Amino acid sequence: NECISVKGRIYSILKQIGSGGSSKVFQVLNEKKQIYAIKYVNLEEADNQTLDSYRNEIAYLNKLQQHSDKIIRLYDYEITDQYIYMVMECGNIDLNSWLKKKKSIDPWERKSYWKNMLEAVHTIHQHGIVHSDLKPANFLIVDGMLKLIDFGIANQMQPDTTSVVKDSQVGTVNYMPPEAIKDMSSKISPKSDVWSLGCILYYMTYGKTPFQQIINQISKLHAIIDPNHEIEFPDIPEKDLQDVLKCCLKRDPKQRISIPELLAHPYVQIQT
Ligand SMILES: [Cl-]
Ligand SMILES: [Cl-]
């Protein structure tokens, strides 16, 4: 059936994982029958700003390879004026797809994923990137590890079928930090990613993001910035987890906990 050549290396297409804006992802095999994911981007009719954002995303992905194995591997790539191919490490399943099909998450699993997420995001912060759009879909489960897939630089959407890609009703403000919303009139910092990570852990803890129940988007944004609107933190066995969540979801980012401090938190450091 179909092949893709990248830097002269031939890859046969096992299957298509999804589509995007003008994008496709495929599971492929090399000549030794080792599996990879190839992202294809059609550059035809794409503007400098999008090109530049992909160029910049690739440069960062490329550079940060060496710094953390909680970043998706970029084995190789090919860029012309007409297209991009990126040869990347293939995963098992994204975190959102995984969480959506899980009844309840094992406490140990949750903690372990939490550590992976902190480390990946810590890495990008150390190279001056604030992602600013973190959600479960930005993480891929690989060998039982979470790996960050993108840096929020590229104007890309993670792979899905035709109906989802053309669905105007996807794109949540459920993970959006208060300081971004008050920005609207640079409030965004590494603390913004802490809030979003906090919403992911909260989800993995209580089965919903903090404001998921507010269905009107404008109402939801109103609740996110409203200090008087209390976030519920139901008592749970893991008191360290409960604390983490309270520390990540402080509306004032100066009061909000940082990543280096999350990495020294009991929830992360003390076992059983
Ligand atoms: Cl895309
Ligand atoms: Cl629990």
CA dist 177 and 200 (Å) reads: 12
Identify whether the C-beta of residue 256 lies closer than 8 Å to the C-beta of residue 194: yes
Q: For 207, what's the count of Cα atoms within 13 Å in the CB-facing half-sphere?
A: 6
Task: Read off the tokens for 37.
Answer: 């994911």
12 CA distance to ligand 1 centroid (A)? 22
SS3 track for the chain: CCEEEECCEEEEEEEEEEECCCEEEEEEECCCCCEEEEEEEECCCCCHHHHHHHHHHHHHHHHHCCCCCCECCEEEEEECCCEEEEEECCCCEEHHHHHHHCCCCCHHHHHHHHHHHHHHHHHHHHCCCCCCCCCHHHEEEECCEEEECCCCCCCCCCCECHHHHCCCCCCCCCCCCHHHHHHCCCCCCHHHHHHHHHHHHHHHHHCCCCCCCCCCHHHHHHHHHCCCCCCCCCCCCCHHHHHHHHHHCCCCCCCCCCHHHHCCCHHHHCCC
Nearest to 211 by CA among 200, 198, 221: 221
**Cα angle: 238, vertex 112, 98; to 5 degrees:** 100
Q: Write out the binding residues.
A: 17-25, 39
**Which residues belong to the annotated binding site for ATP?**
17-25, 39
Q: Does 167 participate in catalysis according to the annotation? A: no
Q: Is the Cα dihedral 135, 140, 145, 148 positive or negative?
A: negative
Ligand nearest to the CA of 84: 1
Residue type, 138: N
Residue 71 main-chain phi, psi, to 5 deg: -100, 135
Q: What is the CA radius of gyration of the chain?
A: 19
Name 137's Cβ contacts closer than 8 Å, sequence gap at least 6: 94, 95, 96, 97, 149, 158
Q: Starting from the CA of residue 104, give the closest ligand.
A: 2
CA 109 – ligand 2 centroid, Å: 12
Task: Identify whether the C-beta of residue 118 lies closer than 8 Å to the C-beta of residue 124.
Answer: no
**All domains of the chain in start order, with CATH:** 4-92 (3.30.200.20), 93-272 (1.10.510.10)
CA distance 30 to 94: 23
For 30, list phi and psi in degrees, rounded to 5. -85, -170
- CA 123 to centroid of ligand 1, rounded, Å: 24
Residues 6+ apart with CB under 8 A from 122: 68, 259, 260, 263
- Residue 235 sits at the vertex; the CA angle it makes with 203 and 199, to the nearest 5 degrees, is 20
Q: Which two tokens stand for residue 63?
A: 């550079």
d(CA 90, CA 110): 22
Task: Check: CB of residue 192 under 8 Å from CB of residue 177.
Answer: yes
What strands, in cross-sheet order, belong to the sheet with 139-142? Answer: 93-94, 139-142, 145-148
Catalytic residue among 47, 52, 133, 226: 133
CA angle 70, 127, 247 (to 5 degrees): 70
Identity of the residue numbered 173: V
Instruction: Name the residues around ion ligand 2, CB cutoff 5 A.
Output: 236
